[PDB]
Design a protein around this ligand. Structure first.
Ligand code: BR
Length: 340
C-alpha cells in the first residue's frame, strides 16, 4: 500500500529498463515540468506513436492511480524495447530524448520554452595561447553536467576539477592557424546554472585496461545544500547559486545487472521517500544521502534545485491542472483497457 504509506505511487517493473523508472519519478516531481507536459496539445496524436502523449499518460497515472504504473506505451513510443537500447545509453541520454520531444511539442503553445527555462545553463569553453595573442571562445548550452568522481572526495572537488585549466603542450599543442602549433591552455567557465541542476556522477566508465565497462564504487560525498556561486564568472547579489538536494538516483552491484532506485524529497522539505519500482516507502534523510556516498549502494546522479526557484519549480499540481480533454482521452483509453 505505497499510496497509503507515502501518498505516492510507484512504477511497474516490467522490463530491463535500468535507470528509466528512477528518471521518470525525478521528472514527475519536477512539478513545473509536469504541469507544462499536461498542456501539450496531443488531442490529434496517435496513441501508440506519440512520446508527448505517452509521458502525459505516465504522469497522469502517477498522479491518480492507487496501483503501480506501467510504462510499455512509453517505451514503445521512443523505440527502446530491448535491454540493448538501455545498455547502449546512459541516463542523461534518455533524459535528452524525453525532454527534446517534449520541448518540440511545446513550440507554438503557451508553455513554449519550459525545458530551457528549467534545465538549460550557459557556459564558455575557451582555448588561450600563451606565446601568441590568440583566444577562441565558444559559448555553449548544457542541460546536464557530467562530473568525474575518481580521485575526488566530494562535489566541490569535482567542480574544481571540472573548471580546471588543461595545458596543451608537447605532442598535444594547439593548432593556432596562422600561428602554427602553439602551447596553450584550455578550460571551461560557468556563466549560469539552471533552476533544476542534473549532475551525473561518472561511476560508469569504459576501462582502457580491459575492453569492459566498469563501475567505480569509491566513496564520494554530496551535500543536502550545495553553494555554487564561486564557480560562476560573475555572481548576483540578489540570487546566489545556492542549491537544494531534490533527488538521488542510486545503483548497487555490477555494471551488468544491478539494482536501480531513486530517493526524493518531492516537496523539497527534507522529508524523503525511497522509490523502488512498485514500492514507495518513507526513509530517513541519512538513508537518502549519506548511505549513498559509497565505500554496494551508491549514487550515480543527483538533482538539485536553485533555492530561489524551489517554490516555482515545485509548485502545487491539482487535478484541475490537467485539461479536461486530456483527462477524457486517458479515461476513455483506460475504459477500453478495462474491457480488455
Ligand atoms: Br503498460
Amino acid at each position: 500500500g505505497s499510496k497509503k504509506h507515502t501518498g505516492y505511487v510507484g512504477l511497474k517493473n516490467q522490463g530491463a529498463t535500468c535507470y528509466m523508472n528512477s528518471l521518470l519519478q525525478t521528472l514527475f516531481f519536477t512539478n513545473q515540468l509536469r504541469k507544462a507536459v499536461y498542456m501539450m496539445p496531443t488531442e490529434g496524436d496517435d496513441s501508440s506513436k506519440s512520446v508527448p502523449l505517452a509521458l502525459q499518460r505516465v504522469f497522469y497515472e502517477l498522479q491518480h492511480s492507487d496501483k503501480p504504473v506501467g510504462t510499455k506505451k512509453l517505451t514503445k513510443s521512443f523505440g527502446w524495447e530491448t535491454l540493448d537500447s538501455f545498455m547502449q545509453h546512459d541516463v542523461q541520454e534518455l533524459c535528452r530524448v524525453l525532454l527534446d520531444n517534449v520541448e518540440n511539442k511545446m513550440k507554438g503553445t503557451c508553455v513554449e520554452g519550459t525545458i530551457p527555462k528549467l534545465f538549460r545553463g550557459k557556459m564558455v569553453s575557451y582555448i588561450q595561447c600563451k606565446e601568441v595573442d590568440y583566444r577562441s571562445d565558444r559559448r555553449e548550452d548544457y542541460y546536464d553536467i557530467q562530473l568525474s568522481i575518481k580521485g575526488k572526495k566530494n562535489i566541490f572537488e569535482s567542480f574544481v576539477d571540472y573548471v580546471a585549466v588543461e595545458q596543451l603542450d608537447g605532442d598535444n599543442k594547439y593548432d593556432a592557424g596562422e600561428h602554427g602549433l602553439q602551447e596553450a591552455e584550455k578550460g571551461v567557465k560557468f556563466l549560469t546554472l539552471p533552476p533544476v541542476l542534473h549532475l551525473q556522477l561518472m561511476r560508469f566508465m569504459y576501462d582502457p585496461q580491459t575492453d569492459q565497462n566498469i563501475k567505480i564504487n569509491d566513496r564520494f560525498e554530496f551535500p543536502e545544500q550545495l553553494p555554487l556561486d564561486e564557480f560562476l564568472q560573475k555572481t548576483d547579489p540578489k540570487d546566489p547559486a545556492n542549491y537544494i538536494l531534490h533527488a538521488v538516483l542510486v545503483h548497487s552491484g555490477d555494471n551488468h545487472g544491478g539494482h536501480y532506485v531513486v530517493y526524493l524529497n518531492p516537496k523539497g522539505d527534507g522529508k524523503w521517500c525511497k522509490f523502488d519500482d512498485d514500492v514507495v516507502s518513507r526513509c530517513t534523510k541519512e538513508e537518502a544521502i549519506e548511505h549513498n556516498y559509497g565505500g554496494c549502494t551508491n549514487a550515480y546522479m543527483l538533482v538539485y534545485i536553485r533555492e530561489s526557484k524551489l517554490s516555482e519549480v515545485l509548485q502545487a499540481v491539482t487535478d484541475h491542472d490537467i485539461p479536461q480533454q486530456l483527462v477524457e482521452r486517458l479515461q476513455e483509453e483506460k475504459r477500453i483497457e478495462a474491457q480488455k
